[PDB]
Amino acid sequence: MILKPIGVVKSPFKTQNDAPRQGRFSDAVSEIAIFDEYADGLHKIENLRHIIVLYWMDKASRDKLRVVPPGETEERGVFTTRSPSRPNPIGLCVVEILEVERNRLKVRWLDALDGSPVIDIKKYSPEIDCVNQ
Amino acid sequence: MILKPIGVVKSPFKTQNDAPRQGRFSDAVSEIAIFDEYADGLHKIENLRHIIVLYWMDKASRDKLRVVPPGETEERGVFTTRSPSRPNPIGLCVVEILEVERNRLKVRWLDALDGSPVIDIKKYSPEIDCVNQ
Numbered sequence: 001m002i003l004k005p006i007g008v009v010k011s012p013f014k015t016q017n018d019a020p021r022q023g024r025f026s027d028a029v030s031e032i033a034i035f036d037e038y039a040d041g042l043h044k045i046e047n048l049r050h051i052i053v054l055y056w057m058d059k060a061s062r063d064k065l066r067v068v069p070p071g072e073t074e075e076r077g078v079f080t081t082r083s084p085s086r087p088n089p090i091g092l093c094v095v096e097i098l099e100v101e102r103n104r105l106k107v108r109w110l111d112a113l114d115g116s117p118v119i120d121i122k123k124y125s126p127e128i129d130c131v132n133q
Numbered sequence: 134m135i136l137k138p139i140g141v142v143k144s145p146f147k148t149q150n151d152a153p154r155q156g157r158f159s160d161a162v163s164e165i166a167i168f169d170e171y172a173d174g175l176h177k178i179e180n181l182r183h184i185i186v187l188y189w190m191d192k193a194s195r196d197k198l199r200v201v202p203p204g205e206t207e208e209r210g211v212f213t214t215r216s217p218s219r220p221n222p223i224g225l226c227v228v229e230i231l232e233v234e235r236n237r238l239k240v241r242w243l244d245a246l247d248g249s250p251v252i253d254i255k256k257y258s259p260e261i262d263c264v265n266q
């Protein structure tokens with residue numbers, strides 16, 4: 001299983017120390033530049049307000065299985081958290097499209113470090129992404 | 134980027150012909166067996182009711198950029214859908230944990246074909262995975 005990057009992220013977060021814990025609590029604007037060879041996968045995306053972005057957290061550790069979430073004292077499995085470190089550092093964010101510039105998207109709520117590779121983008125859908133509780 | 138398979142899915146969905154398009158609409162129970170090597174990642178997962186599962190749709194086409202959803206006539210980009218076919222066929226599911234054995238989890242709302250590779254697991258979080266509109 002080999003992932004082929006379909007784009008790259010451009011944001012104001014250069015290092016792990018600059019990006020927000022969770023993009024939903026930040027007003028920072030990020031850019032998703034999809035590669036020309038995949039650009040055609042954006043057809044009619046301007047009809048969407050919210051999308052799901054999967055990116056690769058390249059500087060994250062891939063052999064860490066236990067972590068202490070911020071504010072916590074004891075460790076827990078990474079699969080029970082949103083920590084960047086995990087066997088497959090896939091960053092998952094629900095973002096809001098603010099603009100569509102050809103093969104580039106201006107969005108907010110994305111918390112990827114500048115330069116992070118983009119893996120996939122899907123339609124955000126309340127009925128399947130949200131749990132009524 | 135290369136993905137490490139952290140587990141395998143066991144489900145009653147053999148092929149795309151008997152699999153729910155969206156697992157949230159099915160009541161079928163699926164099992165996620167994580168390889169011992171990553172077992173530590175499940176530490177304290179029994180304390181959760183909902184988690185997000187990322188799996189690899191290994192029999193899906195990776196060279197389609199457009200598709201026509203079931204209840205649709207016009208085609209749109211795969212990045213505006215939840216369709217299997219896309220550059221990186223990663224299935225995304227919010228699931229409900231019914232049971233936790235040792236390295237195995239029985240959940241519902243998963244729509245992975247039987248034997249599909251598991252890629253990642255994250256805690257489900259309303260405030261970030263769901264948009265309040």
Ligand SMILES: C[S@@+](CC[C@H](N)C(=O)[O-])C[C@H]1O[C@@H](n2cnc3c(N)ncnc32)[C@H](O)[C@@H]1O
Pocket residue numbers: 015016017018019020021022023056057058059060082083084090091092093111112113116117255
């Ligand atoms: C908690 S993660 C977001 C995880 C996402 N909500 C998810 O569910 O997968 C955001 C943090 O990961 C770090 N991060 C973002 N992009 C990264 C990258 N390309 N490599 C390493 N770390 C990254 C940032 O420092 C940021 O504070």
Ligand SMILES: C[S@@+](CC[C@H](N)C(=O)[O-])C[C@H]1O[C@@H](n2cnc3c(N)ncnc32)[C@H](O)[C@@H]1O
Pocket residue numbers: 122148149150152153154155156189190191192193215216217223224225226244245246249250
């Ligand atoms: C629409 S996809 C699920 C997408 C997921 N809910 C998401 O948000 O990314 C589910 C469909 O893809 C197909 N599918 C599931 N697992 C697969 C696999 N391992 N290989 C190929 N196709 C698969 C099944 O036929 C099923 O009806």
